[PDB]
Ligand binder design. Structure first.
Ligand code: A9M
Ligand code: CL
Length: 134
């Protein structure tokens, strides 16, 4: 699996543990239900080391653009202001966020033609499965 393998337009097909993950993040109920219901597309572009992740929905669209391994300031879809580093490790794009002495990691990996997005914060894990839009 490679970084360029992640590039493209992706649609959410399956989600597990998302609500609990968002609660661990501190997302309130109203916002949680909105997030869970509006099921996005995630557009990723990989121009060399320069990685852009755009998450699009009818309710909110967020984008970050980073260089691999360089720390950057991210404003997340729920409004957290984090310091983030993306790395590439064992076939996965690893996005590590830190804010308020807390941390979360989001891993994106191509498995069997699908993008698997694993989100961890503390004891709360979320798995989200995306498929490539034709
Ligand atoms: C999928 C993005 C959430 C939908 C966009 C926000 C919609 C409503 C606005 C605010 C509600 C906040 C929802 C959770 C935001 C960030 C949690 C991590 C999302 C993520 O990377 N999730 C892994 C999949 O990319
Ligand atoms: Cl930002």
């Amino acid at each position: 699996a490679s970084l360029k393998d992640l590039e493209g337009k992706w649609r959410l097909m399956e989600s597990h543990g998302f609500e609990e993950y968002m609660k661990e993040l501190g997302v309130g109920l109203a916002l949680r239900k909105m997030a869970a219901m509006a099921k996005p597309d995630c557009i990723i572009t990989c121009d060399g080391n320069n990685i852009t992740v755009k998450t699009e929905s009818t309710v909110k669209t967020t984008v970050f653009s980073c260089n691999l391994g360089e720390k950057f300031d991210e404003t997340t879809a729920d409004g957290r202001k984090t310091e983030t580093v993306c790395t590439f490790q064992d076939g996965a794009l690893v996005q590590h966020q830190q804010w308020d002495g807390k941390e979360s990691t989001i891993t994106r990996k191509l498995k069997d033609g699908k993008m698997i997005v694993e989100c961890v914060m503390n004891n709360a894990t979320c798995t989200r499965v995306y498929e490539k839009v034709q």
